[PDB]
Amino acid sequence: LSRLERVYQSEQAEKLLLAGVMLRDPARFDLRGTLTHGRDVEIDTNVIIEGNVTLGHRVKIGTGCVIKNSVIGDDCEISPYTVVEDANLAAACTIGPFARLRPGAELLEGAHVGNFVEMKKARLGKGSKAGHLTYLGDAEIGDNVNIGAGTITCNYDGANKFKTIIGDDVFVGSDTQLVAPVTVGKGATIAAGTTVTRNVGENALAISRVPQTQKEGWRRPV
Amino acid sequence: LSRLERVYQSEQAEKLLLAGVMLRDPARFDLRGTLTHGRDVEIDTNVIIEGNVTLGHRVKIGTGCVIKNSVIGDDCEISPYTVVEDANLAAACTIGPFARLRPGAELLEGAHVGNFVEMKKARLGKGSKAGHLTYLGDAEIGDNVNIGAGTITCNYDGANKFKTIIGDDVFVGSDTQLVAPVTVGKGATIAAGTTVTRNVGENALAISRVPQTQKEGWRRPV
Amino acid sequence: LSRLERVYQSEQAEKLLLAGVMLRDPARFDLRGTLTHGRDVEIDTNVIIEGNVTLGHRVKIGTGCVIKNSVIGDDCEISPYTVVEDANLAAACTIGPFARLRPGAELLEGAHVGNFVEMKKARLGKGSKAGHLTYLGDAEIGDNVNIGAGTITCNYDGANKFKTIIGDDVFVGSDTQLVAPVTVGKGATIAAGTTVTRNVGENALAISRVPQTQKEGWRRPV
Ligand SMILES: COc1cc(OC)c(S(=O)(=O)N2c3ccccc3C[C@H]2C)cc1NC(C)=O
Ligand SMILES: COc1cc(OC)c(S(=O)(=O)N2c3ccccc3C[C@H]2C)cc1NC(C)=O
Ligand SMILES: COc1cc(OC)c(S(=O)(=O)N2c3ccccc3C[C@H]2C)cc1NC(C)=O
């Protein structure tokens, strides 16, 4: 079985080259299902396409990516070592390297997802960004929102999962915990480090911060 | 040396196929040491097995994984781009993608380790979960424990390393800092965002949270 | 184009072997630009070298790494699935696995960067460590500094980027948020979980922590 199915991977790689896809190495490509694509698609080494996948025009997929049952709009750039499962990307999204989209990730036009970021059942609005070290689960995020490094939707209480809704034009400071269910109004700002347990008004700053203090001459243990 | 040792990798890949291992691509497989395996093992592209490794039955290892000196029980699923070194997994553990187990990681039956999670000298009990963006070092974690996204054992003070002990049936809220040495009693709940500096009683909620407030009409700088 | 340029990758791999580089698999190596190297360099599977790259002696590069326009000093160890772009590493740095250095990352002698750590326009001093789940952007970090898991430079306010400066001999507790622009004096200690909004004095402990409390007999929802 193994050698035979490996041969069928060469066939596919070859047919893809003939149909105008740029494969960096046809010997390091795997298609387990069906791929539909537009023009000028570029696929790097060690990519694996699973299930039923569709790529628009000029999509670029970097080394090591795994894309399963997903829809990827024109001009998207998927950077190295990014895993995508049952997600939809609109045109001109940039994700990765080291991004992980679980089923139900919906990215709107121009959205950005950076390194060590995970999405599941979450929509990221147009031009919105989640650049670092973040989990967004069971969330609606509006357009032109900035999701600071370290932000986490607390969506699961051990019994049920609950929905977070963030409005347009929101700035989420780093290391914010969004305790679901919670809604953050359009234009609001969440201070870095905030534990958000209550709805935030439009154009409001939400904060839950102890003033910084200092003790002089502190010796660490030797 | 290089071409010769590459040939010896083909030999191994071939012998593994003959012995009933399912290798997705024998040309993208590396065994640097010895592998013992049960029946129905499936190994994807670009896996590297190092040192002395043993896999039970029906173990599935996804693309890009690196497994060194480890013991992996029956039915485990190791997802893509996961690195495992000197770890033991009981039956039916699921780890990755992008998990990183350092020496001394001990996972008990059915345990789960998600993306961007690191373990070192830490035991994860039966059916317990650490799904996201977490470091567990020098820790004992009991059975049926949930470790929320963003949790970190503070195990090292710049001089020494100290042990964290979490009991059975504990819910660790997201972004908890466990300041070692510390013990959290069976059934307890740690509120999201808590800095745990003192032992937590059985069935207790521990919390260290400033009430959320809000200022109206907050303008961000242009 | 594809098959022809693939052939030129074999040529390069072959020339590199002749020039004394240890390539684990010449069929899984890609050079897109120019590589200069010293003696005893070891390069594992699925590495991609981009732009103009220089490696000192005895550099070891693990599986899946992507290195572009970078300078890597003698004795460095780059662990698996690490992405490096426009960075300089001094001698004896260890980075990865799963590290991500963006342009302007400058690592001084013996520095360490661990899993799920991102640097951009940031200097890491001699013997300094950032082992886990951290973003350092637009930062100066001195020598013999420990950057705890979960630390984040808050460098961007939605309008501008600002600089964080950490002195020599500083201990940054886990999950610290550094709100830029901010300076932390030589020898200081930041308590785990602190939101640093004000400059920290030399040899001072900075802290912003609510005392832990506990409520007895807390039932989670069923
Ligand atoms: C420098 O970047 C920041 C500064 C800052 O306050 C000075 C805050 S904040 O959240 O404390 N905050 C914010 C956030 C955005 C704009 C202005 C301010 C003032 C203040 C209330 C956040 C960041 N950046 C990130 C990514 O968190
Ligand atoms: C919705 O998910 C959560 C809710 C929640 O409080 C309403 C808390 S909590 O930690 O603030 N907390 C918890 C945690 C579990 C169950 C019930 C409560 C009430 C409260 C004291 C935590 C989460 N989830 C995660 C992963 O952190
Ligand atoms: C056990 O490791 C720690 C202990 C600790 O306090 C007991 C603190 S702390 O930041 O709360 N803190 C520190 C930090 C370093 C040395 C001594 C102390 C005492 C106290 C003020 C931090 C860590 N480790 C990490 C990685 O954060």
XYZ file of N, CA and C in Angstrom, chain B residues 35-150:
348
model
N 13.878 1.360 17.253
C 12.439 1.543 17.430
C 11.780 0.171 17.642
N 10.991 0.046 18.714
C 10.188 -1.166 18.963
C 8.762 -0.712 18.784
N 7.902 -1.535 18.164
C 6.505 -1.036 17.912
C 5.521 -2.165 17.963
N 4.255 -1.866 18.279
C 3.172 -2.866 18.148
C 2.552 -2.855 16.750
N 1.317 -3.304 16.658
C 0.657 -3.461 15.356
C -0.013 -2.140 14.974
N -0.281 -1.965 13.693
C -1.121 -0.857 13.166
C -0.602 0.538 13.491
N 0.707 0.667 13.673
C 1.362 1.988 13.870
C 1.424 2.777 12.556
N 1.087 4.061 12.614
C 1.089 4.879 11.406
C 1.983 6.064 11.617
N 2.973 6.222 10.720
C 3.943 7.295 10.886
C 3.931 8.190 9.653
N 3.691 9.486 9.858
C 3.615 10.376 8.689
C 4.995 10.858 8.195
N 5.013 11.758 7.218
C 6.285 12.352 6.682
C 7.159 13.076 7.696
N 8.472 13.015 7.435
C 9.466 13.848 8.122
C 9.533 13.596 9.619
N 9.175 12.373 10.044
C 9.414 12.006 11.445
C 10.859 11.529 11.682
N 11.399 11.887 12.828
C 12.735 11.483 13.257
C 12.595 10.829 14.638
N 13.048 9.563 14.711
C 13.035 8.744 15.930
C 14.505 8.676 16.352
N 14.766 9.053 17.599
C 16.121 9.139 18.170
C 16.288 8.329 19.442
N 17.484 7.737 19.612
C 17.777 7.005 20.857
C 17.028 5.680 20.836
N 16.427 5.325 21.954
C 15.774 4.041 22.079
C 14.298 4.326 22.357
N 13.426 3.991 21.396
C 12.020 4.423 21.459
C 11.131 3.166 21.356
N 10.037 3.176 22.114
C 9.082 2.072 22.050
C 7.641 2.685 21.889
N 6.886 2.166 20.902
C 5.512 2.559 20.585
C 4.614 1.358 20.800
N 3.449 1.566 21.427
C 2.500 0.462 21.608
C 1.728 0.275 20.283
N 0.549 -0.348 20.367
C -0.277 -0.606 19.195
C -1.080 0.584 18.767
N -1.297 0.710 17.466
C -2.197 1.733 16.958
C -1.796 3.185 17.295
N -0.541 3.383 17.676
C 0.026 4.735 17.804
C 0.065 5.475 16.453
N -0.349 6.732 16.432
C -0.362 7.543 15.178
C 0.517 8.745 15.402
N 1.468 8.952 14.496
C 2.403 10.042 14.679
C 2.337 10.907 13.446
N 1.951 12.165 13.637
C 1.777 13.087 12.497
C 3.077 13.699 11.950
N 2.960 14.560 10.924
C 4.123 15.038 10.172
C 5.104 15.833 11.063
N 6.406 15.689 10.813
C 7.377 16.559 11.421
C 7.712 16.252 12.868
N 7.152 15.225 13.491
C 7.449 14.974 14.917
C 8.876 14.439 15.188
N 9.398 14.731 16.382
C 10.753 14.303 16.766
C 10.563 13.602 18.106
N 10.894 12.316 18.123
C 10.651 11.496 19.333
C 11.961 10.774 19.756
N 12.431 11.088 20.958
C 13.739 10.636 21.377
C 13.600 9.941 22.722
N 14.150 8.725 22.863
C 14.186 8.026 24.192
C 12.885 7.992 24.986
N 11.793 7.681 24.308
C 10.449 7.869 24.905
C 9.680 6.571 24.764
N 8.628 6.463 25.573
C 7.766 5.312 25.656
C 6.356 5.805 25.395
N 5.726 5.235 24.386
C 4.404 5.746 23.963
C 3.398 4.602 23.946
N 2.353 4.741 24.766
C 1.461 3.643 25.046
C 0.494 3.459 23.881
N -0.301 2.388 23.964
C -1.243 2.001 22.901
C -2.200 3.165 22.615
N -2.577 3.335 21.354
C -3.618 4.326 20.976
C -3.277 5.784 21.094
N -2.037 6.141 21.431
C -1.696 7.550 21.482
C -1.760 8.204 20.122
N -2.139 9.489 20.089
C -2.122 10.310 18.845
C -1.200 11.512 19.026
N -0.098 11.508 18.276
C 0.866 12.586 18.414
C 0.666 13.438 17.159
N 0.183 14.663 17.350
C -0.198 15.538 16.214
C 1.026 16.241 15.638
N 0.880 16.964 14.486
C 2.094 17.513 13.821
C 3.041 18.428 14.617
N 4.335 18.369 14.275
C 5.317 19.330 14.801
C 5.282 19.304 16.316
N 5.385 18.088 16.869
C 5.489 17.910 18.299
C 6.875 17.269 18.600
N 7.529 17.755 19.655
C 8.926 17.290 19.999
C 8.774 16.621 21.339
N 9.235 15.378 21.393
C 9.180 14.561 22.607
C 10.548 13.985 22.998
N 11.047 14.336 24.199
C 12.343 13.846 24.648
C 12.296 13.250 26.077
N 12.689 11.979 26.223
C 12.643 11.252 27.493
C 11.290 11.360 28.231
N 10.189 11.126 27.515
C 8.859 11.217 28.108
C 8.189 9.845 28.116
N 7.212 9.680 28.982
C 6.418 8.441 28.961
C 4.993 8.889 28.754
N 4.308 8.306 27.766
C 2.872 8.517 27.587
C 2.173 7.214 27.867
N 1.169 7.238 28.746
C 0.279 6.064 28.933
C -0.628 5.873 27.686
N -1.478 4.862 27.662
C -2.436 4.641 26.556
C -3.333 5.881 26.348
N -3.708 6.119 25.091
C -4.792 7.009 24.731
C -4.554 8.501 25.056
N -3.282 8.919 25.213
C -2.904 10.343 25.275
C -2.945 10.981 23.930
N -3.335 12.250 23.894
C -3.313 13.022 22.641
C -2.425 14.228 22.948
N -1.319 14.410 22.208
C -0.479 15.635 22.342
C -0.246 16.352 21.014
N -0.088 17.676 21.073
C 0.217 18.496 19.889
C -1.065 19.015 19.238
N -0.926 19.637 18.033
C 0.314 19.972 17.359
C 1.159 21.018 18.111
N 2.463 21.125 17.824
C 3.301 22.149 18.510
C 3.368 21.963 20.019
N 3.364 20.711 20.490
C 3.695 20.451 21.913
C 5.192 20.108 22.036
N 5.727 20.343 23.235
C 7.097 20.187 23.444
C 7.216 19.519 24.828
N 7.507 18.233 24.830
C 7.783 17.486 26.095
C 9.307 17.270 26.284
N 9.802 17.858 27.381
C 11.217 17.723 27.816
C 11.357 16.523 28.747
N 12.615 16.119 29.058
C 12.799 14.950 29.886
C 12.018 15.029 31.179
N 11.483 13.883 31.551
C 10.744 13.801 32.790
C 9.259 14.100 32.620
N 8.775 14.419 31.418
C 7.313 14.505 31.186
C 6.678 13.115 31.300
N 5.679 12.993 32.185
C 5.021 11.708 32.442
C 3.542 11.985 32.281
N 2.925 11.435 31.233
C 1.472 11.604 30.982
C 0.691 10.337 31.307
N -0.364 10.468 32.100
C -1.103 9.266 32.547
C -2.233 9.065 31.532
N -3.026 8.022 31.693
C -3.994 7.573 30.687
C -5.020 8.638 30.213
N -5.113 8.818 28.892
C -6.058 9.777 28.358
C -5.669 11.261 28.513
N -4.497 11.594 29.014
C -4.134 12.994 29.243
C -4.038 13.740 27.908
N -4.173 15.065 27.937
C -4.122 15.891 26.714
C -3.213 17.052 26.862
N -2.365 17.255 25.878
C -1.484 18.390 25.871
C -1.651 19.068 24.498
N -2.029 20.356 24.483
C -2.423 21.089 23.273
C -1.284 21.869 22.660
N -1.637 22.788 21.782
C -0.625 23.657 21.138
C 0.109 24.683 22.016
N 1.409 24.823 21.739
C 2.261 25.788 22.441
C 2.265 25.513 23.968
N 2.394 24.223 24.292
C 2.460 23.771 25.666
C 3.785 23.044 25.857
N 4.464 23.357 26.970
C 5.758 22.748 27.288
C 5.651 22.052 28.659
N 6.150 20.828 28.756
C 6.276 20.136 30.042
C 7.749 19.749 30.268
N 8.200 19.816 31.524
C 9.534 19.308 31.918
C 9.431 18.769 33.324
N 9.890 17.536 33.609
C 9.835 16.981 34.972
C 8.439 17.249 35.597
N 7.390 16.863 34.880
C 6.033 17.142 35.296
C 5.164 15.959 34.958
N 4.260 15.562 35.885
C 3.333 14.465 35.658
C 1.910 15.039 35.498
N 1.247 14.601 34.438
C -0.150 14.975 34.085
C -1.082 13.770 34.215
N -2.014 13.881 35.171
C -2.804 12.736 35.587
C -3.834 12.331 34.548
N -4.629 11.345 34.937
C -5.465 10.618 34.021
C -6.588 11.511 33.527
N -6.799 11.616 32.212
C -7.892 12.433 31.708
C -7.657 13.935 31.951
N -6.484 14.341 32.452
C -6.217 15.759 32.640
C -5.780 16.498 31.367
N -6.057 17.818 31.316
C -5.860 18.561 30.072
C -5.081 19.838 30.245
N -4.117 20.059 29.365
C -3.436 21.375 29.305
C -3.378 21.779 27.823
N -4.389 22.518 27.398
C -4.678 22.698 25.982
C -3.928 23.819 25.276
N -3.362 24.815 25.991
C -2.838 26.003 25.300
C -1.843 26.796 26.079
N -0.708 27.092 25.449
C 0.116 28.253 25.799
C 0.491 28.194 27.303
N 1.090 27.079 27.728
C 1.310 26.756 29.131
C 2.693 26.132 29.297
N 3.333 26.477 30.403
C 4.525 25.799 30.830
C 4.239 25.089 32.201
N 4.489 23.778 32.261
C 4.447 22.978 33.501
C 5.818 22.345 33.713
N 6.521 22.875 34.705
C 7.863 22.410 35.078
C 7.867 21.984 36.546
N 8.480 20.844 36.857
C 8.672 20.415 38.260
C 7.308 20.407 38.955
N 6.342 19.733 38.348
C 4.953 19.777 38.857
C 4.349 18.371 38.935
N 3.474 18.158 39.922
C 2.612 16.969 39.984
C 1.188 17.490 39.724
N 0.513 16.989 38.676
C -0.892 17.334 38.402
C -1.799 16.091 38.472
N -2.840 16.174 39.294
C -3.651 14.993 39.577
C -4.543 14.624 38.399
N -5.533 13.743 38.647
C -6.455 13.224 37.602
C -7.678 14.194 37.382
N -8.212 14.255 36.135
C -9.390 15.060 35.853
C -9.167 16.546 36.237
N -7.955 17.054 35.989
C -7.634 18.421 36.233
C -7.706 19.199 34.897
N -8.258 20.410 34.923
C -8.189 21.256 33.750
C -7.168 22.414 33.944
N -6.169 22.476 33.075
C -5.150 23.509 33.184
C -5.457 24.561 32.113
N -5.962 25.713 32.536
C -6.450 26.706 31.537
C -5.343 27.295 30.654
N -5.672 27.779 29.455
C -4.673 28.463 28.618
C -3.863 29.454 29.424
N -2.557 29.547 29.146
C -1.776 30.641 29.787
C -1.219 30.356 31.174
